[PDB]
Amino acid sequence: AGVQCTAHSWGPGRAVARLPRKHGGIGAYANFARGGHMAHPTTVIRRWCRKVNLNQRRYAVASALAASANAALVEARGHRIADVPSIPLVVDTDNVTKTKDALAIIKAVGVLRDVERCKDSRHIRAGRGKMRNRRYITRKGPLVIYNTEDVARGFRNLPGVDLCHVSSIRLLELAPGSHPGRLILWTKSAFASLDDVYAAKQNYTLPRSCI
């Protein structure tokens, strides 16, 4: 880009600036000329990824999990949990394949206001980006963590809800926007298994508690 033409500088002595010119006299090549190249064009050899030690990734996920059970942090983050019985919230749901039954459970455990918070917040984003396949924006709802149960089909279509298997929890879902306290709904099996999913991390010790 910017270097496909033939352009050479005229010298001094013709009453014009010394940049390269095309045959008719049009300026070319320079970054301050119309049609020229970038001063320092962007390249793909830029380093796009970053390295994180395994121990610190594990520390971060554990700390976010511990924040998710604090109630005060869950309220400080955006979540409507006035009607929630307890934190952590554990529910024995068996298998759910109809969205109607999932909604029934959601209303039963007193978490419906957070789903309606997201269902009513869909809108069109400002600026560019709406023409880059990012047209719509919604708020974040509760997160469902399961294990040896079929709840995905029931819960998939509720706006704001996200699903996770208990053996591979994602940090970007525990702390959306880098804010840690997110409301989580646990199935019974997921809680019981989490009891020892950390015992399968070989030669790993949980960091010590402090004041």
Partner 1 sequence: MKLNSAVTASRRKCRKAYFTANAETRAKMMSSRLSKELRAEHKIKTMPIRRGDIVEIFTGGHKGTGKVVEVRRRDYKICVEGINQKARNPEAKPVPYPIHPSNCIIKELYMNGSRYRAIKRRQERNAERLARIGK
Partner RNA sequence: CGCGGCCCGAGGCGGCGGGGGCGACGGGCGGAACUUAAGCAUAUCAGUACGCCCCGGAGGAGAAACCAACCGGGAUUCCCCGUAGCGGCGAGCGACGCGGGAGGAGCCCGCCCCGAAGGCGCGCUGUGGGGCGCACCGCCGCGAGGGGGCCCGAGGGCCCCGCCCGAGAGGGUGCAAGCCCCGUACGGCGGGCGGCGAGUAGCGCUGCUUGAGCGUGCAGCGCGAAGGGAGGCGCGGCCCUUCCAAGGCUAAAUACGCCCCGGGACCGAUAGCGGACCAAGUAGCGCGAGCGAACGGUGAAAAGGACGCCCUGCGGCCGCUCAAAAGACCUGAACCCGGCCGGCCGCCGGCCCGCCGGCCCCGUCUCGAAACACGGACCGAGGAGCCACGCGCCGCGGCGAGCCCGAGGGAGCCCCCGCGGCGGAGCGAGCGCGAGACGCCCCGGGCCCGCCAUGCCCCUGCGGGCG
Partner RNA sequence: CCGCAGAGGCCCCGGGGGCGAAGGCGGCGCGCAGGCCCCGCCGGACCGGCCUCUGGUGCAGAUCUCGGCAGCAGUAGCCGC
Contact between 159 and K ion by CB under 5 A: the answer reads no
Q: How far apart are CA 109 and CA 86, in angstroms?
A: 10
Cα dist from 12 to 19, 34, 58, 153, 161, whole Å: 10, 22, 66, 76, 69
Give the count of beta carbons closer than 10 Å to the beta carbon of residue 197.
14
90 binds, among RNA, partner 1, K ion, none (CB under 5 to 8 A by kind): none
What does the per-residue mask of binding to RNA show for 99-138, with x meaning CB under 7 A? xx--x---------x--xxxxxxxxxxxxxxxxxxxxx--
In angstroms, the CA 211 to CA 4 distance is: 66
Count residues contacting RNA (CB under 7 A)?
102
73 is in an annotated binding site: no
77 token code pair: 């983050």
Q: Is 192 a binder of RNA (CB under 7 A)?
A: no
Chosen from K ion, partner 1, RNA, none, partner binding at 148 (C-beta under 5 to 8 Å by type): none
Shortest spacing between CB 131 and RNA, in angstroms? 5
Of 112, 108, 138, the residue nearest 125 (C-alpha): 138
* Interface with K ion (CB under 5 A), residue from 2, 20, 27, 35: 35
Helix or strand holding residue 20 (H, E): strand 20-21
Binding site for partner 1 (CB under 8 A): 131, 133, 135, 156-157
What CA–CA distance (Å, rounded) separates 81 from 69?
Answer: 12
Footprint (CB under 7 A) of RNA, residues 138-167:
139-140, 153-154, 156-159, 165, 167
Min separation Cβ 26 and K ion, Å: 9
- Is residue 62 involved in binding RNA (CB under 7 A)? no
Under rule CB under 7 A, which residues in 10-49 are in contact with RNA?
A: 12-13, 15-19, 22-23, 25-27, 31-36, 38-40, 42-43, 45-47, 49
List residues forming the annotated binding site. 19
List residues forming the annotated binding site for Mg(2+). 19
